[PDB]
Amino acid sequence: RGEYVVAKLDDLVNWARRSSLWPMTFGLACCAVEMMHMAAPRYDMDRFGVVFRASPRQSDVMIVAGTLTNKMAPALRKVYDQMPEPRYVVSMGSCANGGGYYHYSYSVVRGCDRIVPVDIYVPGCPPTAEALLYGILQLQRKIKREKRLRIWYRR
Amino acid sequence: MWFEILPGIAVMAACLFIPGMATAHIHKFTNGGKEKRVAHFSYQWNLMERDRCISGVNRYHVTKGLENID
Amino acid sequence: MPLVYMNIIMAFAIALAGLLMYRSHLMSSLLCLEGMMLSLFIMSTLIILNTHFTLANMMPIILLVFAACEAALGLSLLVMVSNTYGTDYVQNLNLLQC
Amino acid sequence: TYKFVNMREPSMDMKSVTDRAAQTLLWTELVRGLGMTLSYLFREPATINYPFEKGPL
Amino acid sequence: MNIMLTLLTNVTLASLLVLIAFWLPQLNAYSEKTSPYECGFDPMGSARLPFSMKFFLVAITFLLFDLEIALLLPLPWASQTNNLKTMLTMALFLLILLAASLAYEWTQKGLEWAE
Amino acid sequence: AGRIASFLKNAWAKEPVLVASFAIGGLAIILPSLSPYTNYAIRINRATPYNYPVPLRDDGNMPDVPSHPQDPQGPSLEWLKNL
Amino acid sequence: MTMYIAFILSTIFVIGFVGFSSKPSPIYGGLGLIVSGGVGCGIVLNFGGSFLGLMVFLIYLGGMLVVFGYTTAMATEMYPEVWVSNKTVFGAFVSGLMMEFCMVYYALKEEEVEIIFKFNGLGDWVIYDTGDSGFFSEEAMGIAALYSYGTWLVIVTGWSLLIGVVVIMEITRGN
Amino acid sequence: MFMINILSLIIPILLAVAFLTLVERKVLGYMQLRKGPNVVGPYGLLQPIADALKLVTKEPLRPGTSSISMFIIAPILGLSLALTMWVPLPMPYPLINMNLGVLFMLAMSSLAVYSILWSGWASNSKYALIGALRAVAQTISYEVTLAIILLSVLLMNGSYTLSTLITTQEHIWMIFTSWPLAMMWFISTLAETNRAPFDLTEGESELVSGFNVEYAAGPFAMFFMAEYANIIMMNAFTAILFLGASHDPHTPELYTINFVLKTLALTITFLWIRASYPRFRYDQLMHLLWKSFLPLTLALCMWHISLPIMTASIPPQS
Ligand code: SF4
């Protein structure tokens, strides 16, 4: 029956998405520098099909790298709202995940989730480059477990 | 470890390889083993037309020598 | 006189109408003007290739070289009215009245 | 103490001007960098196979 | 025929690519996507205003040089003439006029990208 | 004297491209007149028979024109073979 | 049947011209001119004018490029016009379609259309000429004769292009 | 079987462009101490497939402030011209023996402006409207130099028949006669394809992308296909034009192998240059050709038109 064909097809599609996610950089603080180290020779993000450089129009994943302040929030909102589907947003760093060192500030939102949906919470201050990379791999396995056309066929 | 690039362009080479003989072979395939008779000037076109008429099969690349004539 | 001659002559007639009957735009009008010379270029090439006028084979490009020069200044004039006036819309183009 | 970084003004003999004209026209420092990057191409790539291999701690 | 067949094949192939591109994927079609973009913001009230520019002069001298390039294009056929001396002098005239136009463009600001 | 040489040196340093272009151009006009082979190029161009050499009606007293296409007398281009 | 192509090449030339002259948005007039020139290059080409056809291709698809170059510079506005903006443009367009259609219908029925001059509706393939070219293209050799017989033409042109760059300098100089 | 030959021309060029997107990410990375993509299949061989599938099934966003007609036509023009501009290339037996093949292909090379302008304006964004005019000026201002270089090089070939170009070289590489010219030509090629040293349109500080900003998914990928097909096509053009090869008529495959090797070498030089050099500035970008390249090109053309006359070595017309 139809599950065989639809599962093989959507498995193909989600594999293609999984191995070609394109980050939308978006580094706000030292988490940006650690991500840049994560794209350095040593860990070489670009090996996994991730491309690091991506205009927000052509991109799949946003890494909220650093503290997100009140003045920033509308800009990040307009950036994500324009991001084409599918759009998984990963938050790196204790500051972006929620609060941070500057949790009890006056012009820093207490978490990217209060601004934008977060798909993978990456902890660390900063999350050491390979921890970020592991979060990326976790998102890849999340894309692997994707059943879009299955749910369509079984709606 | 530059040889990791070697597969990458190798298929690429093959990718550019195919348009080479494919056009080359098909010409040889179509024109009775001969390569295509390029007609860059009207004299060449007239020669090709007379060859087509003489062939009697509406195929220019078919050629007959003195055995065709007395 | 076959249909190709009709078609390019008729194309020239409507280019005459389009450029000369202004609607509201100077840029589009000179665009119609340069399309005019395209119609004339094709037309000229037709007889010249037809009649084996071997020398006249060089007349079209010659005819071409000057014609673009006209447009070369036309659009050049277009900017000079544009920076002061603002647009190429020829209905404000009224200061010279008396 | 201190060192002046860029005061090395060039000479103006025929040899020096010919060398500078050749470098400007026959692109040389361009080729210098173009060949250095080639040397880095043939080198051993620095890359750790995550997650099979982890960074030193 | 032949050549026209290749042009037809290419244009139809391209159109199939764009059709699959624009039709196959699915979009939720929500309003706020339509908001335009500029490095995080939107392009305020611009991206169609008249463009106060200066390299217009470079753009027009392009065309003026392109006419002369068209004029000198017949050279490979022209070199096959009996009176090679006149062809040599007159082609050299054409390139000298190219250079003179460029030089007048040069000294009189001109090709110097206006500020 | 000194001023001209110094100006040439400065041009060769300040805008080297300009002097190279001006030089090679200045050659481009003055060599063809000086060169002794341009006449040979004219001979090359006149040698090629793009059209048929339509014969002349024989009536006697044209020894210059060969009677046969294999005849010895007539125009020859052995210089073309040696060239 | 691809017999009538040498006809239709001109026909698509006509109605691509009308929309080009239908006074639409300047870029849409440009598109009309572009399709007209692209289809007219075929008209010259299938008549044997290979070099002239490719020549007009090159120079003209640069020439409309530059007239674009100011259309987005010195001709755009807050609300650029659209090929459907004005109501009259549709009437101009349809008046473009029906005139040559009626005339070609007549030329297909009577073959003696009386519009302006004298014309016959019996295609265009007839007017070609039998013959040969040896080992030289007539068009290329003719345009090559510019440097041997075009004594005055190249001189007056080059002088005009020099004067043209001078005037382009002077009018746009801006004091 | 003509249409079969056509398809055997398009489709392999499509795989070539597809795997160029892998060889660039591998060559660049190895040039900058990165292993490159080697996770999707063996040595990253399958990676171009995955990104292509993603971009096909990525949502193509319609620019709300746009007229869709040009938003769709511009990819059509850019892609179709790029592929049909491969038509008259002298493979050992070129597909279409157009008597003016070089002029044919040079004329079509100017048409990329006719995708750039509609992409930049129709998408209706500041980055798009800037980059449209900037890139248009780039490519048009380098097209002239391409033209005089082509003419000066051809003045020794004999005609515009691009199949006889091989017959021109035969003995010696043509660069040995026009290395000053080719050095300009190649660079101008680098300028016309908008590559990192001369790109100026991406400029990911003040133009971001320039023309392919609002384009997404499929129409967006079509302009990449055009761009990385022009790379291969112009590198192949330069390869035959200057880096000649042998061709025995009884063995057509030999010239095919030599030509594809030359094309790969030149494309690797493209990637080589982009992986090292900084990016030009628009001021310097047009200063490079107006102030420097064009006078040298004019003088070299004068030299190369006077030279056959004085040497009595005019090339055969037919
Ligand atoms: S979580 Fe730590 S490293 Fe990241 S932005 Fe906050 S303070 Fe900096």
Curated annotation (Swiss-Prot), chain C:
Topology relative to the membrane: Multi-pass membrane protein
Known catalytic reactions: a ubiquinone + NADH + 5 H(+)(in) = a ubiquinol + NAD(+) + 4 H(+)(out)
Annotated GO MF terms: NADH dehydrogenase (ubiquinone) activity
UniProt enzyme class: translocase
Any Gene Ontology biological process: ATP synthesis coupled electron transport
A Pfam family annotated for this UniProt entry: Oxidored_q2
EC number: 7.1.1.2
Annotated transmembrane regions: 1-21, 29-49, 61-81
Chief subcellular location: mitochondrion
Subcellular location per the Swiss-Prot or TrEMBL entry: Mitochondrion inner membrane
The keyword Transmembrane helix belongs to this UniProt entry's keyword annotation: yes
One Gene Ontology CC term in the entry: respiratory chain complex I
Keyword match NAD: yes
UniProt entry keywords in alphabetical sequence: Electron transport, Membrane, Mitochondrion, Mitochondrion inner membrane, NAD, Respiratory chain, Translocase, Transmembrane, Transmembrane helix, Transport, Ubiquinone
Its biological purpose: Core subunit of the mitochondrial membrane respiratory chain NADH dehydrogenase (Complex I) which catalyzes electron transfer from NADH through the respiratory chain, using ubiquinone as an electron acceptor. Part of the enzyme membrane arm which is embedded in the lipid bilayer and involved in proton translocation.
Stated family: Belongs to the complex I subunit 4L family.
Description of how the protein assembles with itself and partners: Core subunit of respiratory chain NADH dehydrogenase (Complex I) which is composed of 45 different subunits.
Name the UniProt record assigns to this protein: NADH-ubiquinone oxidoreductase chain 4L
Taxonomic source organism: Sus scrofa (Pig)
Gene responsible for this protein: MT-ND4L
UniProtKB/Swiss-Prot annotation, chain E:
UniProt-listed InterPro entries: NADH_UbQ/plastoQ_OxRdtase_su3, NDAH_ubi_oxred_su3_sf
GO molecular function, one term: NADH dehydrogenase (ubiquinone) activity
Entry keyword annotation includes Nucleotide-binding: no
A Pfam family the protein falls into: Oxidored_q4
Swiss-Prot/TrEMBL keywords: Electron transport, Membrane, Mitochondrion, Mitochondrion inner membrane, NAD, Respiratory chain, Translocase, Transmembrane, Transmembrane helix, Transport, Ubiquinone
EC number in record: 7.1.1.2
Source organism superkingdom: Eukaryota
Compartment(s): Mitochondrion inner membrane
Transmembrane segments: 3-23, 55-75, 86-106
Keyword Translocase: yes
GO cellular component, one term: mitochondrial inner membrane
Catalytic activity: a ubiquinone + NADH + 5 H(+)(in) = a ubiquinol + NAD(+) + 4 H(+)(out)
Record membrane topology: Multi-pass membrane protein
Enzyme class at the top of the EC tree: translocase
Disulfide bonds: none
GO biological process: mitochondrial electron transport, NADH to ubiquinone
Entry function: Core subunit of the mitochondrial membrane respiratory chain NADH dehydrogenase (Complex I) which catalyzes electron transfer from NADH through the respiratory chain, using ubiquinone as an electron acceptor. Essential for the catalytic activity of complex I.
Subunit annotation: Core subunit of respiratory chain NADH dehydrogenase (Complex I) which is composed of 45 different subunits. Interacts with TMEM186. Interacts with TMEM242.
Family classification: Belongs to the complex I subunit 3 family.
Protein name stated in the entry: NADH-ubiquinone oxidoreductase chain 3
Swiss-Prot record, chain G:
Example GO biological process: mitochondrial respiratory chain complex I assembly
Example of a GO cellular component annotation carried by this entry: mitochondrial inner membrane
Localization, UniProt: Mitochondrion inner membrane
Keywords: Electron transport, Membrane, Mitochondrion, Mitochondrion inner membrane, NAD, Respiratory chain, Translocase, Transmembrane, Transmembrane helix, Transport, Ubiquinone
Listed InterPro entries: ComplexI_Subunit6 (IPR050269), NADH_UbQ/plastoQ_OxRdtase_su6 (IPR001457), Nuo/plastoQ_OxRdtase_6_NuoJ (IPR042106)
Subunit structure: Core subunit of respiratory chain NADH dehydrogenase (Complex I) which is composed of 45 different subunits.
Name assigned to this protein: NADH-ubiquinone oxidoreductase chain 6
Reactions listed under catalytic activity: a ubiquinone + NADH + 5 H(+)(in) = a ubiquinol + NAD(+) + 4 H(+)(out)
Entry-linked Pfam families: Oxidored_q3
GO molecular function, one term: NADH dehydrogenase (ubiquinone) activity
Family the entry assigns: Belongs to the complex I subunit 6 family.
EC annotation from Swiss-Prot or TrEMBL: 7.1.1.2
Gene3D superfamilies, per the entry: NADH-ubiquinone/plastoquinone oxidoreductase chain 6, subunit NuoJ
Transmembrane segments: 1-21, 25-45, 47-67, 88-108, 149-169
Job of this protein: Core subunit of the mitochondrial membrane respiratory chain NADH dehydrogenase (Complex I) which catalyzes electron transfer from NADH through the respiratory chain, using ubiquinone as an electron acceptor. Essential for the catalytic activity and assembly of complex I.
Organism expressing this protein natively: Sus scrofa
Domain of life: Eukaryota
UniProt membrane topology term: Multi-pass membrane protein
Record has Plastid as a keyword: no
Source lineage: Eukaryota, Metazoa, Chordata, Craniata, Vertebrata
